[PDB]
């Protein structure tokens, strides 16, 4: 038997070499192994039945039948269309796969596990059987059988030993093929997830576009001949006027298919992907019940129950009434179907994805269900991106509506403009404005207050004997005074509407109302003109600087930045640093965006960029922390400018560096913002009382809603500390600005002088308080 062992070893070696031929199939190697085992144990019609798992239940199917020595492989192979499928609970094969052990039955009639369906199918008689499952990794791959020993009535142990020895190598070849197949499956799954993530995060879009992108991209990896997706209507509740006939009994209530959460099964859109030929893709909005996807009840069943339906030989089913013949005029017959639901976060059914027969003839295994379930889970999760897209659209529309309503409320009506630009009482012209611009300029310049009167040019100006309409008129006069309306050809009616809207934007708070904004604008005007600082800036810069000074405190609520941070205001969440200053800048630019309010309407684009940048610098500069940070740099600039003995050379030193101009502008806006401390004693006393009252209201409100103890500056109970505290404000904040501006320019000397006078008076009240104790 030396030759026998040599031949057996050589044959097993060749059987193992057959796995190395690339482009072949493992079934060829299994077939040659089966023909050699039969030759070895003297048997006929050796068979291999593969094992599959569909719908979570395992089954066996025919892969190799009637294997005999010297038999053609192509004839012994069984195609997917002729295979016979047995559940595990029926047949000897099913029990062999269930037990995962060797089963040798000598007399098949003595076993209740016998199934004669194959005996009747081909008219073959079976009397002896030896079956073994191929189990690696606690999973069954195939069941191998030898049947009807020709020269004996029984399979002995030695036969079973040879059986085990050869299907050890068969198990090796099946393990190799299975590992390759599972690697391919996981590669396809990872590619599907990768591409779906690429397409979902590409753009924020609706359900239809996003799902179409993802599905058309993973098209190559579904490996199906044809598939479709039908989206349900997600409208859960009806309108009242559509519910009236239901509640009146006029129209009978609905009876039919219903989604599990309670909605009506209404496929409102179908997207068909044809892949068998021409790669056609169709979108059916409001598809009929005659649609080939919906002709069977499977998509409606999935919408009604949320199951995953794997069907092999679909037209043979009696429940769903699938199409037995071709679906379309082109020849395509539905063979295997896999339908899965797409599920929202709240477990609602959003769509139904249906995948039709595979590219190869094989049915849908458990791995195809795995891949398609991962895809549907990914789509159900990307539904959050779709919902966020819709919520963003609603928020943007609501913000636009609110801003338009607010602009309509804030903007000056034509009647309010008519109270300043009296076009009719002076030109006898109707409401429609066909007047020349120069005529409007001429008749406005006669109704505005005299700049030389009312001390608009002086630092001692007090707005107390002026009403707020007078303040608007004076501000338009100030804009006329720096000679920018004619130079930059801005419209007069636009300027009047802009200033009236700016006045209306200031709230009715105690101190930060429209009078504060006008006082700061007027102080900017006096610093430019009386203070001789206009020599450092062009006319456009003065225009933007005055316009920024007037709007520096627009829409002030009477609470400082600390209250915005502590109360977690929407302003604090939108703007991180310089909360109120950024709010004022944003609202001023929003006012400038409207064409009827755009005071910078007729200037160049570069001029507009410069004006916007100057607006930002000037408005943000009113944050006192920024002033405390850049005061040293201003001091260094002033020290450098002091040493030059020629005015022109100092002007040249400042002008050629835009950074120096911006620094000087920021402290000019800071000096304007604190100008009330430089007013005469009565004006300063009244304004300081107003400021203290506003701070006390903020402190009381802070204590009421924030449950926090206010600082003594904002605390009402420390009102008798108002004098002494005031001198600290004089000694800590304002004195640096006004001393450096007096050093820089002698014409700003009166401001500081006024401050010093106030420092006397607030001392006289302070010492008296120490005498009161």
């Amino acid at each position: 038997s030396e030759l026998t062992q040599v031949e057996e070893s050589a044959l097993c070696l060749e059987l193992l070499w057959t796995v190395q031929e690339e482009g072949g199939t493992p079934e060829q190697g299994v077939h040659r192994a089966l023909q050699r085992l039969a030759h070895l144990l003297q048997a006929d019609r050796c068979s291999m039945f593969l094992c599959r798992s569909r719908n979570g239940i395992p089954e066996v199917a025919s892969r190799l039948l009637d294997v005999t020595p010297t038999s053609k492989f192509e004839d012994n192979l069984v195609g997917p269309d002729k295979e016979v499928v047995f559940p595990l609970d029926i047949g000897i094969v099913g029990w062999a796969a269930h037990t995962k052990k060797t089963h040798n039955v000598p007399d098949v009639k003595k076993n209740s596990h016998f199934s004669d369906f194959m005996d009747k199918q081909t008219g073959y008689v079976t009397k002896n059987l030896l079956a073994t499952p191929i189990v690696v990794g606690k999973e069954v791959l195939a069941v191998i059988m030898a049947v009807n020993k020709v020269n004996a009535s029984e399979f002995s142990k030695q036969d079973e030993e040879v059986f085990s020895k050869y299907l050890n190598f068969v198990s090796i070849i099946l393990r190799l093929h299975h590992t390759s197949y599972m690697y391919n499956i996981e590669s396809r799954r990872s590619q599907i997830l990768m591409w779906s993530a690429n397409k979902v995060f590409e753009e924020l879009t609706d359900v239809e576009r996003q799902f179409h992108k993802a599905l058309y991209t993973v098209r190559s990896y579904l490996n199906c001949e044809r598939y479709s997706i039908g989206l349900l209507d997600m409208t859960k509740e009806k309108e009242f006027y559509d519910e009236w006939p239901i509640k009146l009994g006029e129209v009978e209530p609905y009876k039919g298919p219903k989604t599990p959460d309670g909605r009506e099964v209404n496929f409102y859109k179908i997207i068909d992907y044809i892949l068998h030929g021409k790669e056609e893709i169709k979108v059916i909005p409001t598809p009929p019940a005659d649609h080939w996807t919906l002709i069977s009840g499977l998509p409606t069943y999935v919408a009604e129950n949320g199951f995953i339906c794997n069907m092999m030989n679909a037209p043979a089913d009696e429940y769903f009434t699938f199409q037995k013949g071709p679906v379309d005029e082109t020849g395509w017959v539905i063979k295997n179907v896999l339908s899965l639901p797409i599920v929202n976060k709240k477990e609602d059914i959003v769509g139904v994805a249906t995948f039709y027969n595979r590219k190869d003839g094989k049915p849908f295994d458990e791995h195809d269900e795995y891949i398609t379930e991962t895809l549907t889970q990914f789509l159900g999760w990307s539904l959050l991106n779709t919902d966020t897209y819709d919520k963003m659209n609603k928020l943007e529309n609501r913000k636009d509506i609110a801003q338009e309503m607010l602009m309509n409320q804030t903007k000056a009506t034509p009647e309010e403009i008519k109270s300043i630009l009296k076009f009719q009482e002076k030109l006898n012209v109707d409401v429609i404005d066909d007047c020349e611009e120069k005529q409007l300029v001429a008749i406005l310049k006669e109704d505005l207050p005299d700049p030389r009167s009312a001390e608009l040019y002086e630092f001692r100006f007090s707005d107390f004997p002026l009403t707020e309409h007078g303040l608007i008129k004076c501000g338009i006069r100030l804009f006329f005074e720096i000679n920018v309306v004619e130079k930059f050809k801005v419209p007069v009616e636009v300027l009047t509407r802009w200033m009236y809207t700016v006045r209306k934007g200031y709230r009715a708070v105690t101190y930060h109302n429209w009078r504060h904004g006008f006082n700061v604008g007027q102080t900017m005007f006096t610093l430019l003109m009386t203070g001789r600082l206009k020599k450092y800036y062009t006319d456009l810069e003065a225009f933007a600087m005055l316009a920024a000074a007037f709007c520096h405190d627009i829409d002030h609520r009477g609470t400082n930045n600390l209250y915005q941070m502590k109360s977690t205001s929407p302003l604090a969440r939108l703007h991180g640093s310089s909360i109120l200053e950024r709010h004022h800048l944003e609202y001023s630019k929003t006012l400038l965006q409207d064409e009827s309010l755009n005071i910078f309407q007729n200037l160049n684009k570069r001029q507009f960029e410069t004006v916007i940048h100057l607006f930002e610098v000037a408005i943000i500069a009113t944050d006192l922390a920024l002033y405390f940070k850049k005061r040293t740099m201003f001091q260094k600039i002033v020290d450098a400018c002091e040493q030059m003995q020629t005015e022109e050379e100092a002007i040249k030193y400042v002008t050629v560096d835009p950074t120096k101009k911006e620094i000087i502008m920021a402290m000019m806006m800071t000096a304007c913002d604190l100008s009330a401390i430089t007013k005469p004693w009565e004006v300063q006393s009244q304004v300081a009382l107003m400021v203290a009252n506003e701070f006390w209201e903020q402190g009381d409100l802070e204590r009421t809603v924030l449950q926090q103890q206010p600082i003594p500056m904002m605390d009402r109970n420390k009102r008798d500390e108002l004098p002494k505290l005031q001198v600290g404000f004089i000694d800590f904040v304002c004195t640096f600005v006004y001393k450096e501006f007096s050093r820089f320019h002698k014409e700003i000397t009166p401001m500081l002088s006024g401050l010093q006078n106030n420092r006397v008076e607030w001392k006289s009240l302070a010492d008296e308080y120490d005498a009161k104790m």
């Binding site: 995953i308 429940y319 922390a625 800590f732 904040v733």
Partner: protein, 39 residues
Amino acid sequence: KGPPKFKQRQTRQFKSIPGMEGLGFNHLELHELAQYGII
């Protein structure tokens, strides 16, 4: 007749993070800045 048996969705796999608790001026001037609410 009757519908074939089908499989339920495997929502138990994803039905369902440490370290997420903290993941979401001049020296003399500071007292006076806090006194006046500048900061």
